[PDB]
Design an enzyme around this catalytic site. Sequence first.
Site, mmCIF file in Angstrom:
data_model
loop_
_atom_site.group_PDB
_atom_site.id
_atom_site.type_symbol
_atom_site.label_atom_id
_atom_site.label_comp_id
_atom_site.label_asym_id
_atom_site.label_seq_id
_atom_site.Cartn_x
_atom_site.Cartn_y
_atom_site.Cartn_z
ATOM 1 N N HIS A 83 0.827 -1.199 0.000
ATOM 2 C CA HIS A 83 0.000 0.000 0.000
ATOM 3 C C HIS A 83 0.865 1.254 0.000
ATOM 4 C CE1 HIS A 83 0.660 -0.613 4.328
ATOM 5 N NE2 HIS A 83 0.434 0.685 4.465
ATOM 6 N N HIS A 85 1.553 3.961 1.766
ATOM 7 C CA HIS A 85 1.929 4.776 2.915
ATOM 8 C C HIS A 85 3.431 5.029 2.927
ATOM 9 C CE1 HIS A 85 -1.841 4.020 5.614
ATOM 10 N NE2 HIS A 85 -2.014 5.025 4.765
ATOM 11 N N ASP A 87 5.849 4.591 4.954
ATOM 12 C CA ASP A 87 6.732 3.542 5.475
ATOM 13 C C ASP A 87 6.798 2.299 4.592
ATOM 14 O OD1 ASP A 87 4.034 3.068 6.359
ATOM 15 O OD2 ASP A 87 4.691 1.889 8.009
ATOM 16 N N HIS A 88 6.127 2.316 3.427
ATOM 17 C CA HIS A 88 6.252 1.229 2.433
ATOM 18 C C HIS A 88 6.585 1.701 1.031
ATOM 19 C CE1 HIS A 88 4.837 -1.078 5.752
ATOM 20 N NE2 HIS A 88 3.817 -0.248 5.866
ATOM 21 N N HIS A 159 -7.022 -1.140 4.954
ATOM 22 C CA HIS A 159 -5.953 -0.357 5.550
ATOM 23 C C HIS A 159 -5.742 0.900 4.700
ATOM 24 C CE1 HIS A 159 -2.373 0.422 7.963
ATOM 25 N NE2 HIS A 159 -1.772 0.745 6.832
ATOM 26 N N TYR A 190 -8.195 4.558 13.167
ATOM 27 C CA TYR A 190 -9.209 4.841 12.153
ATOM 28 C C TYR A 190 -10.570 4.940 12.807
ATOM 29 C CZ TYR A 190 -5.947 3.244 8.381
ATOM 30 O OH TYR A 190 -4.907 3.073 7.537
ATOM 31 N N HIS A 224 4.977 -5.088 7.576
ATOM 32 C CA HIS A 224 5.575 -5.121 8.912
ATOM 33 C C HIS A 224 5.763 -6.606 9.267
ATOM 34 C CE1 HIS A 224 5.144 -0.845 9.573
ATOM 35 N NE2 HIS A 224 3.996 -0.940 8.936
HETATM 36 C C1 LIG Z 1 1.957 4.757 10.513
HETATM 37 C C2 LIG Z 1 1.851 3.264 10.157
HETATM 38 C C3 LIG Z 1 1.319 3.121 8.733
HETATM 39 S S1 LIG Z 1 1.248 1.410 8.151
HETATM 40 C C4 LIG Z 1 0.945 2.579 11.166
HETATM 41 O O1 LIG Z 1 -0.169 3.073 11.325
HETATM 42 N N1 LIG Z 1 1.363 1.490 11.857
HETATM 43 C C5 LIG Z 1 2.672 0.889 11.717
HETATM 44 C C6 LIG Z 1 2.750 -0.289 12.672
HETATM 45 C C7 LIG Z 1 1.441 -0.292 13.418
HETATM 46 C C8 LIG Z 1 0.516 0.773 12.846
HETATM 47 C C9 LIG Z 1 -0.641 0.006 12.248
HETATM 48 O O2 LIG Z 1 -0.647 -0.218 11.014
HETATM 49 O O3 LIG Z 1 -1.495 -0.505 13.026
HETATM 50 ZN ZN LIG Z 2 -0.051 1.720 6.277
HETATM 51 ZN ZN LIG Z 3 3.263 0.568 7.686
#
Ligand SMILES: C[C@H](CS)C(=O)N1CCC[C@@H]1C(=O)O
Ligand SMILES: [Zn+2]
Ligand SMILES: [Zn+2]
Length: 266
Positions: A83, A85, A87-88, A159, A190, A224
């Site tokens: 996706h 975001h 961090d990906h 997500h 969310y 993750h």
């Molecule tokens: C900011 C990131 C975007 S995947 C996030 O919301 N995280 C990363 C690890 C846990 C949490 C989630 O996806 O529940």
């Molecule tokens: Zn995400």
């Molecule tokens: Zn993430």
Amino acid sequence: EVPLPQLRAYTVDASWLQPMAPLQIADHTWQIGTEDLTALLVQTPDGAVLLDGGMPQMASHLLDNMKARGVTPRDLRLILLSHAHADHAGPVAELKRRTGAKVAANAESAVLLARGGSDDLHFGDGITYPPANADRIVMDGEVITVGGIVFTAHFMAGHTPGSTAWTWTDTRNGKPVRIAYADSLSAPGYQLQGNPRYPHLIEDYRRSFATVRALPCDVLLTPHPGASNWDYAAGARAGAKALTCKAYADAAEQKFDGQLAKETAG
Ligand SMILES: C[C@H](CS)C(=O)N1CCC[C@@H]1C(=O)O
Ligand SMILES: [Zn+2]
Ligand SMILES: [Zn+2]
């Protein structure tokens, strides 16, 4: 007088930014990201594919790991995403500039990527990154083949609208291994119920749990690694404790049902 707050950078746990050497998953498939962010390299006789890149600042690390594998910038043909975001998909723009890679993504992921993650349905502009353009738009169930490795898209909206699982078949010890790179099934902070920006969010998540449960799935990997119980720092037993897709989906749904109840209570 009180000024407006400074912009806040998207900061993460150190492990998410900790470089690691390439970790072999199957005969053509390697983890080349950090200890706590997946970035999969699939290497073939007809070029290489990268599924996710992690955080924006991981671009050079990925290229160093590629080079360690024998993959030059020219050899990288394709980038796929779980996706879009930060961090990906973070380093995607930079990778496109520095390699021959083209991006294939569904329409939802393409539009979010083109916005650099801005105006996120849930995070607004909290988590942005350099925008990138998709070169090819894929439809649900569409296949993309690179050097014999056949990647199938399985849309699993929730997500993010464009969340996707990618599946392909590699080998290990002369036997097929059906790898499933399933996207996040979390909903971090969310609003799930009656969300005006995502009215059918709950139905999409439920359909996505079902999709994930049914994937061809000898080995599950997730953006993750912790979500599928991978430990990339554990060397020869990195994937030993990995969940099945069935168990991942079940855990995700249980967590989701708990979050819905908490939301109603809050
Ligand atoms: C900011 C990131 C975007 S995947 C996030 O919301 N995280 C990363 C690890 C846990 C949490 C989630 O996806 O529940
Ligand atoms: Zn995400
Ligand atoms: Zn993430």
